[PDB]
Subunit: 168 residues, 4 copies
């Protein structure tokens, strides 16, 4: 078929998963089979929760469209997406491009170069409430790169709020 | 404030309401007050169902962001949106731009010219399952312009399927 | 086969530059492109005051581009006819006149388009905000009045209102 | 105040045309624009082989545009420094090399950008699909190899694979 990789990035609170599911739903109206892969440690179509993509086995071959949510948590995501898109799947990934220090998730970088489409969504600055936000700020003490959570541990911020808060 | 009008259009099954709510949710993370107006005959923030916008009264003035779903059903929508955006509201509208005969909803036309932003979403062709779809085809006999329903009465189609089906 | 793409937005948003960006892409894949402008190897250009004056020349090309669509009175139908014959049709046009009222024909195109992008400009009054409207700066009440930055400026919503007052 | 906008995509997608479209918009609002290209009144232009060679000239302008960003080795840091000083920084760059591997510096920019658009081209092999990849057409294994359609073509995913076989 005509396989492809579509990538949705942006910081937290930007609605990336909502966009992902908007796209899935469109495909479902045309009767395409859709498989949604979520990340296992993360807290109505075919889906699975795994800690890596190799654990999906070959189950993905039964579907037209593969959606991968929270892509930054999967260590082998670029290769998975390329294998699937070479087999003719439409592969849709949502992921953080940047961690709380504004450093890239390397695997998502790889996907940018392999993607047919890349959209970067914004959020609204949760600090000043006046500007578009492109960064995620962690609000709890921790230095683990991976730290699963929501608005209890993070907020999205504009460029100048991210600086200000970093100083204080 | 800085008021604005954002317009989301496209045919049925394109996820316009999903996009609308994605945007609302972004504003809600920055603690903006959001009011969602739906159409009365149509079948977790502040909301109301009305048959026209004049029935909302001045209740809309209590919010930062006003979202209007199914805009093509409201006869006074352009004027409402302009009044609200002149008062400093962010106004977000989802609507069909075109009816099942591919003729414009005139009021949505007005909004295009008054909008700061206009996005037209596509669906996937529900007839051939191979192309982007920009049109809505009605699958039931009726000549009422307004005819409320879902996939039981409509389907979205690409340009050439719309023609083909029209011929048969 | 065919498609209609529409590019709208106020003056000074670069709609024609976007239209040509797209044409160029198609030229790199050896598609033939026919560009129609308004007036009162792979490419081909023409100035006309309406689309009937092009005749059937357009059928020789893969891609048809129409600039300043809001000055052509039969643009909707022309684009539909061409896209039904399998052409990629790309149109740049103002959606709104200086009174923020729609060009009716460009409305019809919105409903018939596969793609619609509305570009913005930068507010020429405050220099601080995205602009979506075109303010006329010279007294007149002719709808059509050809000109440039001497006669028009692109403005944000609130500068449009302000200027309208004073 | 400041911002970084990034425009990516393969060759023949019109990234530089989009970058200039944006610059032009800012010029209509009387913003000063400084355009930096690569080499081995309101405007100002410069060719350089790295961004250190610009010195502090860039501070005199509202908008800084950087073309062919993937040839500059210190682009990420440069753009961050400029956006922290309140500049609007606009960068066009290849995200991927002819082997579909990323330019590492353009990666860093993706994470630091307020806006990222990836443009497509039209497949120069099949002439039927959107193209997101750049295929090199001449044998070589130098990463950097300056050239045009003689040496490169933009292709869709499946034409990239096909050609890679034969
Ligand atoms: C910014 C982040 C986020 N995260 C986590 C927090 C959330 O569980 C998840 C992102 O949620 P998202 O799906 O993109 O809405 O990633 C990290 O582990 N490290 C970081 O640096
Ligand atoms: C195309 C349509 C649709 N409709 C209705 C069917 C649906 O109730 C509604 C559109 O649903 P939507 O919200 O855009 O997902 O509009 C008409 O009344 N007339 C038409 O010509
Ligand atoms: C906004 C507007 C522009 N124009 C013109 C100015 C330019 O000649 C052209 C826009 O490129 O259209 C009008 O004729 N009427 C209008 O209402
Ligand atoms: C894809 C690719 C392009 N280029 C060049 C070709 C052009 O000179 C320039 C793109 O405008 O970069 C490389 O040097 N290496 C690459 O891998
Ligand atoms: Zn902020
Ligand atoms: Zn179809
Ligand atoms: Zn202004
Ligand atoms: Zn191809």
């Amino acid at each position: 078929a005509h396989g492809r990789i579509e990538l949705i990035i942006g910081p937290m609170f930007a609605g990336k998963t909502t966009e992902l599911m908007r796209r899935v739903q469109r495909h479902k109206h045309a009767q395409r089979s859709c498989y949604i892969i979520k990340y296992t440690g993360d807290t109505l179509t075919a889906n699975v929760s795994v800690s890596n993509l190799h654990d999906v086995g070959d189950e993905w071959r039964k579907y037209d469209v593969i959606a991968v949510d929270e892509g930054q948590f999967f260590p082998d995501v670029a290769a998975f997406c390329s294998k699937a898109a070479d087999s003719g799947k439409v592969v849709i990934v949502s992921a953080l491009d940047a961690d709380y220090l504004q450093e890239p998730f390397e695997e998502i970088c790889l996907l940018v170069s392999r993607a047919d489409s890349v959209v970067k969504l914004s959020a609204v600055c949760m600090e000043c409430h006046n500007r578009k936000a492109s960064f995620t700020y962690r609000t709890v003490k921790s230095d683990e790169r991976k730290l699963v959570g929501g608005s209890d541990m993070y907020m999205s911020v504009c460029r100048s709020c991210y600086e200000t808060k970093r100083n204080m």
